[PDB]
Design an enzyme around this catalytic site. Structure first.
Site, PDB file in Angstrom:
ATOM      1  N   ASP A 103     104.230  41.942 120.034  1.00 59.53           N
ATOM      2  CA  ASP A 103     103.479  41.149 121.003  1.00 59.53           C
ATOM      3  C   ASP A 103     104.263  40.987 122.299  1.00 59.53           C
ATOM      4  O   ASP A 103     103.685  41.040 123.399  1.00 59.53           O
ATOM      5  CB  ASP A 103     103.111  39.796 120.399  1.00 59.53           C
ATOM      6  CG  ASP A 103     102.060  39.922 119.299  1.00 59.53           C
ATOM      7  OD1 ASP A 103     100.848  40.054 119.614  1.00 59.53           O
ATOM      8  OD2 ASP A 103     102.458  39.921 118.116  1.00 59.53           O
TER       9      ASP A 103
ATOM     10  N   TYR B 266     102.579  43.883 124.436  1.00 56.56           N
ATOM     11  CA  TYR B 266     101.499  43.161 125.102  1.00 56.56           C
ATOM     12  C   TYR B 266     101.971  42.194 126.182  1.00 56.56           C
ATOM     13  O   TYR B 266     101.160  41.827 127.041  1.00 56.56           O
ATOM     14  CB  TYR B 266     100.670  42.375 124.081  1.00 56.56           C
ATOM     15  CG  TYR B 266      99.810  43.249 123.216  1.00 56.56           C
ATOM     16  CD1 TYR B 266      98.548  43.648 123.640  1.00 56.56           C
ATOM     17  CD2 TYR B 266     100.264  43.693 121.982  1.00 56.56           C
ATOM     18  CE1 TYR B 266      97.761  44.452 122.854  1.00 56.56           C
ATOM     19  CE2 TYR B 266      99.495  44.500 121.198  1.00 56.56           C
ATOM     20  CZ  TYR B 266      98.240  44.876 121.638  1.00 56.56           C
ATOM     21  OH  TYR B 266      97.454  45.675 120.846  1.00 56.56           O
TER      22      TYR B 266
ATOM     23  N   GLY C 108     104.112  36.400 127.766  1.00 57.96           N
ATOM     24  CA  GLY C 108     104.018  35.526 128.923  1.00 57.96           C
ATOM     25  C   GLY C 108     102.690  35.632 129.654  1.00 57.96           C
ATOM     26  O   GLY C 108     102.158  34.633 130.147  1.00 57.96           O
ATOM     27  N   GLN C 109     102.128  36.836 129.746  1.00 56.17           N
ATOM     28  CA  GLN C 109     100.898  36.886 130.533  1.00 56.17           C
ATOM     29  C   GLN C 109      99.708  36.300 129.796  1.00 56.17           C
ATOM     30  O   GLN C 109      98.662  36.106 130.415  1.00 56.17           O
ATOM     31  CB  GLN C 109     100.574  38.307 130.978  1.00 56.17           C
ATOM     32  CG  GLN C 109     100.166  39.262 129.903  1.00 56.17           C
ATOM     33  CD  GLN C 109      99.733  40.602 130.487  1.00 56.17           C
ATOM     34  OE1 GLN C 109      99.684  40.784 131.711  1.00 56.17           O
ATOM     35  NE2 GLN C 109      99.419  41.546 129.613  1.00 56.17           N
TER      36      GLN C 109
ATOM     37  N   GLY D 219      94.909  38.113 120.974  1.00 52.54           N
ATOM     38  CA  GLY D 219      93.830  38.430 120.045  1.00 52.54           C
ATOM     39  C   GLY D 219      93.543  37.264 119.107  1.00 52.54           C
ATOM     40  O   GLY D 219      93.213  36.152 119.537  1.00 52.54           O
TER      41      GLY D 219
ATOM     42  N   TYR E 197      95.835  35.827 117.125  1.00 56.80           N
ATOM     43  CA  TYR E 197      97.024  35.026 116.890  1.00 56.80           C
ATOM     44  C   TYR E 197      97.342  34.078 118.020  1.00 56.80           C
ATOM     45  O   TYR E 197      97.213  34.384 119.193  1.00 56.80           O
ATOM     46  CB  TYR E 197      98.317  35.825 116.720  1.00 56.80           C
ATOM     47  CG  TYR E 197      98.212  37.016 115.867  1.00 56.80           C
ATOM     48  CD1 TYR E 197      98.393  36.972 114.470  1.00 56.80           C
ATOM     49  CD2 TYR E 197      97.959  38.220 116.492  1.00 56.80           C
ATOM     50  CE1 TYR E 197      98.302  38.135 113.716  1.00 56.80           C
ATOM     51  CE2 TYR E 197      97.854  39.421 115.780  1.00 56.80           C
ATOM     52  CZ  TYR E 197      98.028  39.345 114.353  1.00 56.80           C
ATOM     53  OH  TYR E 197      97.963  40.383 113.469  1.00 56.80           O
ATOM     54  N   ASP E 198      97.794  32.881 117.644  1.00 54.57           N
ATOM     55  CA  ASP E 198      98.318  31.915 118.606  1.00 54.57           C
ATOM     56  C   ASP E 198      99.709  31.473 118.154  1.00 54.57           C
ATOM     57  O   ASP E 198      99.908  31.155 116.974  1.00 54.57           O
ATOM     58  CB  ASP E 198      97.390  30.704 118.758  1.00 54.57           C
ATOM     59  CG  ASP E 198      95.934  31.115 119.087  1.00 54.57           C
ATOM     60  OD1 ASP E 198      95.291  31.759 118.229  1.00 54.57           O
ATOM     61  OD2 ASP E 198      95.434  30.796 120.194  1.00 54.57           O
TER      62      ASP E 198
ATOM     63  N   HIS F 212     101.653  40.377 105.551  1.00 50.38           N
ATOM     64  CA  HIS F 212     102.324  40.752 106.787  1.00 50.38           C
ATOM     65  C   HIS F 212     103.480  39.788 107.017  1.00 50.38           C
ATOM     66  O   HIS F 212     103.625  38.786 106.314  1.00 50.38           O
ATOM     67  CB  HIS F 212     101.345  40.702 107.962  1.00 50.38           C
ATOM     68  CG  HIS F 212     100.789  39.334 108.202  1.00 50.38           C
ATOM     69  ND1 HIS F 212      99.718  38.832 107.493  1.00 50.38           N
ATOM     70  CD2 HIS F 212     101.173  38.354 109.050  1.00 50.38           C
ATOM     71  CE1 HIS F 212      99.460  37.603 107.902  1.00 50.38           C
ATOM     72  NE2 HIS F 212     100.333  37.286 108.842  1.00 50.38           N
TER      73      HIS F 212
ATOM     74  N   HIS G 224     104.091  36.134 105.445  1.00 45.85           N
ATOM     75  CA  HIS G 224     102.816  35.445 105.295  1.00 45.85           C
ATOM     76  C   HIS G 224     101.981  36.120 104.203  1.00 45.85           C
ATOM     77  O   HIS G 224     101.415  37.193 104.408  1.00 45.85           O
ATOM     78  CB  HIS G 224     102.081  35.405 106.632  1.00 45.85           C
ATOM     79  CG  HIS G 224     100.895  34.483 106.645  1.00 45.85           C
ATOM     80  ND1 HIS G 224     100.084  34.329 107.747  1.00 45.85           N
ATOM     81  CD2 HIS G 224     100.391  33.657 105.692  1.00 45.85           C
ATOM     82  CE1 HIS G 224      99.117  33.470 107.469  1.00 45.85           C
ATOM     83  NE2 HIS G 224      99.295  33.029 106.235  1.00 45.85           N
TER      84      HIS G 224
HETATM   85 CU   LIG Z   1     100.517  35.339 109.550  1.00 47.39          CU
END
Ligand SMILES: [Cu+2]
Ligand SMILES: [Cu+2]
Lengths: 620, 620
Positions: free
Chosen positions: B290, B294, B297-298, B372, B374-375, B423, B584
């Site tokens: 990420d 990706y 920061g943006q 997407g 995920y936060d 994952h 996870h």
């Molecule tokens: Cu997870």
């Protein structure tokens, strides 16, 4: 009406009356422990039988007794003479603390040792330390404390800055005789003071801290009924208090829609051991079971608003017995409040355009205890999402020694000539599990790495495996942080909507367990502390991982004795005992008073709910 | 005046002007990354040279460029053509997200696959996933994304509840061609919705939560000068922001009396990897960086008062460049506040009669990002007692799949027919250390158990050992929770009053590292994630553990390349890279939106101060 209410002043008085009337509490008797007993399995018998267990010390030297009273029928149920040479001495009495110093102040060996050091006996404080069981055959059946001395320059001086090394004494507190005085040699007494309120040490106080105001203008979201029954954000439980264990949580359960679902029947810290790793014969015997030997509940602090507990605080004031059977209130001994806990859940979706954010909160139940130089906070937290967490906060003043010339491998230097021996603080959590009821089982869950090959052509796969613990003889488990080892407590007869057993996962911190040699005395008496996780079948008399009488017991009682019954634990009334603790290599920053360090554990639901249990939390 | 101030709108405009004037930013060009460069070692050259690094994408297919500009002198310093087939593609562009879905909506293989499933192509969303490097030789030098589809029943439906399994497509986003469509077979599309704002799912909202008011009537105890310089309770630092790394901490230092003592020169999360452990060819390629691919920061959120951040909040609004060089402000992108943190230190002494209690506080610096489904929240904490801590909060919506009939070893079931592949989320902290200056060394500290015997007659002794890491070739270390392994960063030329080197101790959580097979592609590209701790010698161009261009790089760049130089690190300008993350195995409670889980690390002083640094904290 609840059989789980706190003991009241009236009940303890009635226990005092019952014991007196029965001839069990004359003037030479002392209550070394008093506490309510939990109801038996099956409270279907209407009207509770409020029963109390009592340990009665005899100062004249007769044999102590274990007595059980029923304050409901006002009668003695049973009374057993104890053979302490076999099953261990009673817990240390508060009135025996000062006896060690006053006896030594008139023993000629002790005065000789102090005169050699140019020490004024009126300035020498003596710590009343538990004795353990070592190679002194004459200590069998005798009630013995050991003494280590610290010099105090003035009544408000911190004595811990001036340890008197090379000197230790053993004392028979019943017959009031000094059995041995050992003087391995003269060490300089560290002269720097450690007075953390003296402006010479602290400098001018900071003026840069502006206030933080935490208020609840509408009051708190929880309610207390019946003295100690808590209802908060679908959680329901009773807060007990035992003079030995401290705060006890009962009947932890969660309102899932309309059904009240049990999770834990009884949660407590059932033992605490602090072993020291200095091989010097002055201190190589030094281990304390603060819970089993001293009873941490009777040393609970009164917690002050805005200092110890901050926010909208609801207090409980538990009642305990003093050494004569009179009720003693611990004012503001337990703090209960809720506190903000940041983001609970958050998502901003690119496709649906919905932005969602919710705050977390936790309920806090805590007390603080002081044993000599040590202070420990016990914190139980309940979270909105079903997580239960325990946290121990260790602070106070480190136990000191001289720092030898030429260094040490087992002591760290905090100040010129001032040492602090290496040690651990190790806890035992006793969790009487009731996941959706009493038919429970424990599984050990490991991460499984998989090899590149057919069915895993890109070498990305990984998995997990769960191993059911079926008999007690296979339920002594070690941590394995490398394979992410955790333990799941499930109910095989209660399934969620996906047809899987409901469960809770225990997340350990994976700190080292007991470091002492497995042939040492402490490895024998603190056997629970050598392993991370034990599971037993429930039984009414198996309450402490060390047994009932820890003081000067030779070892092996408690958990290794329970485990040997090899009972069936696969779908049964089971109990989980989790060992966890801190290994403390003292640092300069721990002196002259040490900032809090923490350790603990937590349990999170694992398919207990049919979906997230916090979908109904509002935005606020 | 500070060379560490945040980039302003004006500076980014001036960068746009400079690039345009130099012919480097015509209409077919796009800024894939823009960020300020840190000053070089030795800022003794008066007046700063504010320089900026830029990655320029070429949409017509020409070779991209790396350009460095000096906005102080208004000139291009260097411009390098990049060979992406050798050194990796540029970061994903935001405007390429939608290109994957629109291309597939008119490809005949994709429409055929949807028609077989009775799916309306106007309801099918396609996630723009990074491609990695696998066995598709035709992907070399091409800018490729992969697509996985989710059905959306209505514009505000949560698409994640309806994964379209057995289907994946690869897409060339520059030449705008669909290179492959793979259809391993038909899986039912899970039909239950996961709309967490729908009252059918949530039920009636709770009315039991009463407000918690956290206010600071006199304002906060910290001060911001120069846009981003923080002074709080003896701490001093600058808060930077990079479109790739997010929040960056600079010049972390502590006012010890009158001297300002450096601790950390630069702290950042320099990479993030999320590997999936499902062996299904539909997803066995799935890994995201990420940060590197990706740029987290943006995607920073605007954080709302009383929802995302609660209390007396001071905001920062960083400025970044859009794809054309225009300044874009992230309003309220960073939260800064102090919060109460319970008891700091506490003792009630039996001999001196003094009762002492002090409260702890922490300074919080945080931002939240969304990629997407995920936060992630990034939290930096500074404590009164000198502790520095990092915490990652993972939430959002889990990535979904079908749940196969007959079960899976690599997917968990969250809902009828709905699966969530296993994952990890793995982070890399880059800590440019400066403990009292730049002459630093790293020691590995293990607990040492000792055997019962002479010199340890009672078998109670234990100790520790420290191993100095002297060359980079020996500075790739593994955790060992069983022996309490930690790492100490010290300055051998700066001693405390006890004549020991000053130091800070790194406390890891000891979670599993990368689980993928060591021969896999991801083990090659995410090599940093296979070990807990790396130490390198500082160098200006060694900034990311994965290298500069992570997107579609074949592997080996970054840390294993830096380490091979085998430079001297014993008393040098060194950098610490700590790997940590979450494994996870999704649970039912993670659905339909998942409560926060956390992971991180912390550093505590180890003989850095001459005594406790919080003796001067008032009582309040
Ligand atoms: Cu997870
Ligand atoms: Cu300690």
């Amino acid at each position: 009406a609840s059989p789980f209410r706190l003991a009241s002043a009236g009940e303890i008085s009635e226990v005092q009356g019952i014991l007196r009337t029965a001839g069990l509490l004359g003037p030479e008797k002392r209550i070394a422990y008093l506490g309510v007993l939990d109801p038996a399995r099956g409270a279907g018998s209407e009207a509770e039988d409020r029963r109390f267990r009592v340990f009665i010390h005899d100062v004249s030297g007769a044999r102590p007794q274990e007595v059980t009273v029923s304050v409901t029928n006002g009668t003695v149920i049973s009374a057993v003479e104890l053979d302490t040479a076999a099953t261990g001495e009673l817990p240390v009495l508060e009135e025996e603390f000062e006896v060690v110093e006053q006896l030594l102040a008139t023993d000629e060996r002790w005065l000789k040792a102090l005169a050699a050091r140019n020490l004024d006996v009126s300035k020498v404080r003596v710590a009343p330390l538990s004795a353990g069981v070592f190679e002194y055959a004459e200590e069998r059946g005798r009630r013995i404390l050991r003494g280590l001395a610290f010099v105090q320059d003035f009544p408000e001086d911190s004595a811990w800055a001036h340890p008197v090394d090379g000197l230790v004494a053993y004392v028979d507190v019943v017959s009031k005789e000094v059995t041995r005085v050992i003087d391995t040699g003269v060490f300089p007494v560290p002269a720097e003071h450690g007075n953390y309120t003296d402006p010479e040490l602290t400098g001018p106080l900071r003026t840069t801290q502006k206030p933080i105001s935490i208020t609840q203008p509408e009051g708190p979201s929880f309610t207390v009924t019946g003295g100690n029954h808590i209802e908060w954000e679908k959680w329901s439980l009773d807060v007990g208090f035992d003079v030995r264990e401290g705060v006890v949580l009962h009947n932890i359960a969660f309102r899932d829609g309309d059904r009240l679902r049990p999770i834990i029947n009884r949660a407590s810290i059932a033992e605490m051991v602090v072993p020291y790793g200095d091989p010097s014969p002055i201190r190589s015997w030094q281990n304390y079971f603060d819970t089993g030997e001293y009873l941490v509940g009777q040393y609970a602090n009164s917690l002050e608003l805005g200092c110890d507990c901050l926010g909208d605080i609801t207090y409980l004031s538990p009642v305990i017995s003093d050494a004569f059977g009179n009720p003693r209130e611990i004012r503001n001994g337990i703090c209960m409040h809720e506190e903000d806990w940041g983001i609970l859940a958050k998502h901003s979706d690119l496709w649906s355009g919905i932005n969602y954010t919710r705050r977390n909160r936790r309920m806090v139940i805590s007390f603080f205890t002081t044993i000599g130089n040590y202070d420990y906070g016990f914190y139980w937290y309940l979270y909105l999402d079903g997580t239960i967490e325990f946290e121990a906060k260790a602070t106070g003043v480190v136990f000191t020694s001289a720092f030898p010339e030429g260094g040490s491998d087992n002591i760290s230097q905090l100040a010129p000539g001032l040492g602090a021996p290496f040690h651990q603080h190790i806890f035992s959590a006793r969790l009487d599990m009731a996941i959706d009821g009493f038919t429970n089982r424990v599984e050990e869950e490991d991460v499984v790495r998989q090899t590149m090959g057919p069915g895993n052509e890109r070498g990305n796969a990984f998995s997990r495996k769960r191993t059911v613990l079926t008999r007690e003889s296979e339920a002594v488990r070690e941590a394995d942080a490398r394979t992410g080892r955790t333990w799941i407590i499930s109910n095989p007869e209660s399934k969620n909507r996906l047809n899987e057993p409901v469960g809770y996962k225990l997340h350990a911190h994976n700190q080292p367990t007991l470091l002492a040699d497995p042939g040492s005395s402490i490895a024998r008496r603190a056997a629970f502390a050598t392993k991370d996780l034990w599971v037993t079948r429930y039984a009414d008399d198996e309450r402490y991982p060390t047994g009932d009488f820890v003081n000067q017991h030779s070892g092996g009682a408690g958990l290794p004795s329970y485990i040997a019954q090899d009972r069936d634990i696969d779908g049964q009334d089971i109990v989980v005992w989790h060992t966890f603790g801190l290994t403390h290599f003292p640092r300069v920053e721990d002196w002259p008073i040490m900032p809090v360090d923490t350790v603990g554990f937590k349990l999170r639901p694992e398919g207990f709910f049919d979906r997230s249990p916090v979908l109904d939390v509002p935005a606020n």
